[PDB]
């Protein structure tokens, strides 16, 4: 339930791709 997609119910809201982030 938490963090649910507002466009496609039943699927979790996929986060945006961030590529490589060096530490």
Binding site for another protein (CB under 8 A): 2-3, 5-23
Which structure tokens are listed for 14? 């996929």
CB 21, min distance to another protein, A: 6
CB 16, min distance to another protein, A: 7
As a whole number of angstroms, the distance between CA 8 and CA 19 comes to 24
As a whole number of angstroms, the distance between CA 13 and CA 11 comes to 7
CB 14, min distance to another protein, A: 7
């Amino acid at each position: 339930c938490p963090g649910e997609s507002l466009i496609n119910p039943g699927f979790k809201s996929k986060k945006p791709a961030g590529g490589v982030d060096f530490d």
